[PDB]
Amino acid sequence: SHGKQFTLYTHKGGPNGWKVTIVLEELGLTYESIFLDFQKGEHKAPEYLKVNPNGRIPALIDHKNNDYTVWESNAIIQYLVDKYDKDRKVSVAPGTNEYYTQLQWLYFQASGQGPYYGQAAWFSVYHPEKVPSAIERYRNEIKRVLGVLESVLSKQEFLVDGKATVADFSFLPWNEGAAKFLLEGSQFEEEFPATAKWHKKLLERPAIAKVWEERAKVS
Amino acid sequence: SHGKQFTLYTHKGGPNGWKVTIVLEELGLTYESIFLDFQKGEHKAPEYLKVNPNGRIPALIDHKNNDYTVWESNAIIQYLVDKYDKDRKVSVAPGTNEYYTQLQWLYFQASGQGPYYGQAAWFSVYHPEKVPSAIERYRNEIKRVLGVLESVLSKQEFLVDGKATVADFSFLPWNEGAAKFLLEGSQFEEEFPATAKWHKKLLERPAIAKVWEERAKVS
Numbered sequence: 170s171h172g173k174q175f176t177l178y179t180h181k182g183g184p185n186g187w188k189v190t191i192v193l194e195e196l197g198l199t200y201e202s203i204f205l206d207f208q209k210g211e212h213k214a215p216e217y218l219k220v221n222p223n224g225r226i227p228a229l230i231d232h233k234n235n236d237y238t239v240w241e242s243n244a245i246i247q248y249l250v251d252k253y254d255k256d257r258k259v260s261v262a263p264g265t266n267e268y269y270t271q272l273q274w275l276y277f278q279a280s281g282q283g284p285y286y287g288q289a290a291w292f293s294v295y296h297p298e299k300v301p302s303a304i305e306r307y308r309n310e311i312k313r314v315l316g317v318l319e320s321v322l323s324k325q326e327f328l329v330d331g332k333a334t335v336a337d338f339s340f341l342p343w344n345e346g347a348a349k350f351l352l353e354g355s356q357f358e359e360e361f362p363a364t365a366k367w368h369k370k371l372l373e374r375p376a377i378a379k380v381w382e383e384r385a386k387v388s
Numbered sequence: 389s390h391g392k393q394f395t396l397y398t399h400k401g402g403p404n405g406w407k408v409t410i411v412l413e414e415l416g417l418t419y420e421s422i423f424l425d426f427q428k429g430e431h432k433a434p435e436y437l438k439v440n441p442n443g444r445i446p447a448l449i450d451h452k453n454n455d456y457t458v459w460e461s462n463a464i465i466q467y468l469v470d471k472y473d474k475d476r477k478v479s480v481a482p483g484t485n486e487y488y489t490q491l492q493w494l495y496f497q498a499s500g501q502g503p504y505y506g507q508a509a510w511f512s513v514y515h516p517e518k519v520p521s522a523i524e525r526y527r528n529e530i531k532r533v534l535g536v537l538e539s540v541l542s543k544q545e546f547l548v549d550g551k552a553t554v555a556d557f558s559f560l561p562w563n564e565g566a567a568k569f570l571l572e573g574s575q576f577e578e579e580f581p582a583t584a585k586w587h588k589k590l591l592e593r594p595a596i597a598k599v600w601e602e603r604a605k606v607s
């Protein structure tokens with residue numbers, strides 16, 4: 170209905186739709202973003218459940234692949250680079266050892282960064298009572314995850330050693346949350362300097378900077 | 389030294405090492421399980437951090453691929469089926485649409501099931517303070533995830549619809565937690581009958597049943 174290769178179901182504020190948008194833009198692909206209104210329950214409405222039965226964003230429909238539909242941000246991202254980064258600008262080749270190292274880092278992001286950072290967000294902002302021990306638990310886990318990244322990034326430039334890939338990009342949106350709200354003050358920058366430098370440089374890439382400007386705009 | 393194709397770093401009780409063991413056994417692969425003693429801090433010791441800097445299990449070393457090492461259970465699983473399930477017994481082919489649907493489900497498991505079930509376990513069993521609102525939050529999230537699975541499994545046999553795959557298997561260890569204590573009583577079986585039946589039948593597969601005996605032995 171719109172002349173773009175993809176329909177992307179997303180959200181204006183949350184990190185995970187922007188994660189996919191970063192990759193779409195890095196790959197030079199066209200997309201129509203449908204921003205769901207969570208306050209109106211649109212992500213739980215039958216119209217969206219037929220797209221993603223989990224009732225969460227993002228979800229992607231590829232109109233140049235017979236409307237193939239896939240959800241989970243990092244599954245979407247793998248689909249996008251495997252099919253549409255054949256020049257390997259921001260990904261490694263399927264069927265190589267490095268591919269499974271890329272995949273390892275993408276799972277660490279999706280299972281180790283996102284959910285735990287998200288529980289810090291939950292207890293700090295949304296939970297109906299203030300539970301300092303829960304807030305502290307998840308802040309400490311954010312710092313533990315950052316420490317893992319720091320242990321690697323202090324010794325090599327990027328996660329899949331030689332070049333920036335979607336494995337690196339996948340951590341950006343949630344780490345921007347750590348930088349701006351989930352940790353107090355400048356703790357991200359001063360406690361994890363190698364990670365903070367890597368993060369900053371990725372955000373300055375032209376496609377990522379473009380997406381981040383758009384995120385600020387739609388807000 | 390042990391003569392097996394793989395070294396698997398694991399834990400006797402937690403779900404995520406067993407997840408990989410299921411796949412190793414389904415594929416008829418040989419492996420030496422090294423059960424780390426978390427009470428002794430073995431998962432945080434410098435020698436294990438050289439294997440997985442995250443300091444969590446599982447991690448896999450493939451001695452028939454020049455000691456290629458990969459961590460994150462679902463990255464390990466993908467490596468194993470892509471390289472060693474060319475007969476497509478329990479996986480779909482790389483480079484197909486269905487591969488990315490399999491991947492979607494694997495990411496839903498790793499990011500949507502495991503972390504959230506794990507926080508139910510944390511608040512119910514390990515957090516110093518008993519926090520009823522946190523316990524309720526994660527019990528409700530277990531049920532929400534089970535409802536997603538139910539919505540699919542009540543309409544088709546397996547997740548990647550007609551074939552049992554590692555996408556289905558990946559849910560087993562944490563759903564066994566739901567079945568046996570994380571949800572009290574018979575809530576799992578009564579409230580999610582299609583999911584419970586699918587779970588039961590998967591545990592009856594010969595390879596998985598064998599793994600479950602090992603899990604019982606070491607308990």
Ligand SMILES: N[C@@H](CCC(=O)N[C@@H](CS)C(=O)NCC(=O)O)C(=O)O
Pocket residue numbers: 180183184185186207212224225226227240241242243279283495499500
């Ligand atoms: N692991 C999922 C997480 C998706 C997720 O957390 N989405 C959020 C927005 S950032 C959402 O839709 N939240 C609505 C809700 O769950 O109520 C992925 O990476 O796609």
Ligand SMILES: N[C@@H](CCC(=O)N[C@@H](CS)C(=O)NCC(=O)O)C(=O)O
Pocket residue numbers: 183184185279282283284285286287288290291499
């Ligand atoms: N229904 C959600 C609402 C909040 C939500 O969706 N949070 C997202 C971020 S927008 C989250 O924590 N996602 C986890 C992840 O990214 O893995 C909940 O109860 O946590």
Ligand SMILES: N[C@@H](CCC(=O)N[C@@H](CS)C(=O)NCC(=O)O)C(=O)O
Pocket residue numbers: 280281399402403404405426431443444445446459460461462498502
């Ligand atoms: N997303 C990771 C989760 C791994 C995980 O939670 N491992 C647990 C055992 S079930 C662990 O090593 N826990 C020790 C710790 O974190 O202190 C994966 O699927 O491999």
Ligand SMILES: N[C@@H](CCC(=O)N[C@@H](CS)C(=O)NCC(=O)O)C(=O)O
Pocket residue numbers: 280402403404498501502503504505506507509510
């Ligand atoms: N350091 C861990 C200790 C407990 C732990 O490792 N729990 C594992 C299960 S053994 C977990 O919840 N893993 C989450 C997952 O499987 O994604 C924590 O603070 O949560």
